Amino acid sequence: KLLDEFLKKHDLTRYQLSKLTGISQNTLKDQNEKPLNKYTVSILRSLSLISGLSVSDVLFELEDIEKNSDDLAGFKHLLDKYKLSFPAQEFELYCLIKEFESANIEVLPFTFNRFENEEHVNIKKDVCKALENAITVLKEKKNELL
Amino acid sequence: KLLDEFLKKHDLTRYQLSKLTGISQNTLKDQNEKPLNKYTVSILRSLSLISGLSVSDVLFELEDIEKNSDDLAGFKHLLDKYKLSFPAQEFELYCLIKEFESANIEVLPFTFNRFENEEHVNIKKDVCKALENAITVLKEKKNELL
């Protein structure tokens, strides 16, 4: 639940947000179930007001939370297998996938049939390179839309 | 119009947006009439995709456009009467006004009836001071909410 996790991270509750804004607790409950792409600038501003964050930083924190739950077009499964983390590149991949979503465009999952037969002396390096290559593929796909 | 103005700055049309996204022209027409607080993260992402700007810069450019048309609680009239510009302070006043609105609190206009019937040999410094104190006062009022 995106809204609740943001509030909890700042030691805030729906009660306090409701108290500040007059937004009903029913409304905030419905809000908590929506994916980020449905959040309005209005609710980002409310969250900015109560948290002290700029609207841009509110959105980024909400994105970071949503991203931890995202499949990353298949890379999450891979990263989790080897307990790896590439915070910057994972977020970039996430950002590219959400962009395609906003143009109502299918992002086929990346597959690793080749990868997981082949052996890797530095699994961290090789996954990093697969991840960057994926980002490149998406960036190219992006620039051929435009 | 907010959406048109953003698209025009980047040499784009709603038609183009519509063909990239699958969003209908009538929907974008309606979108063009909405204040920025009604914008969804989805539409920001769509605008980021087509413009090449990050969602943050899309948001700021939209904020900037909306700010240039906002009354700024009576200060728009005042600044234009003396054709003055204080970018940072004007934007921060806009920010505060939009924060209060997201908390369903209306900001009463500042009045200048006595100001505008007095001679001002330093109209720049005088209006700057009034703007700085308006922001100071709004910040105090914002703090009593939290």
Rounded to whole angstroms, the Cα distance separating B77 from B71 reads: 7
Counting the structural domains of chain B, the total is 1
Kindly list the distances between the CA atom of residue B61 and the CA atoms of A146, B7, B31, B104, in Å, as whole numbers in the listed order: 21, 11, 16, 24
For A116-142, what is the HEC assignment?
Answer: CCCCCCCHHHHHHHHHHHHHHHHHHHH
Q: Residue B85's CB: how many other CB atoms inside 10 A?
A: 9
Rounded to whole angstroms, the Cα distance separating B3 from B29 reads: 9
Q: What is the resolution of this structure in A?
A: 2.0
Residue of A nearest to B105 (CA): A21
Residue A50: domain span: 1-146
Kindly list the distances between the CA atom of residue B75 and the CA atoms of B52, B108, B145, in Å, as whole numbers in the listed order: 33, 12, 24
**Residue matched to tokens 């040999």:** B121
CB contact under 8 A, A38 and B38: no
User: Does residue B104 belong to the interface with chain A, where contact is any CB pair within 8 Å?
Assistant: yes
Residues from chain A that touch B39, judged by Cβ atoms under 8 A, are 40-41
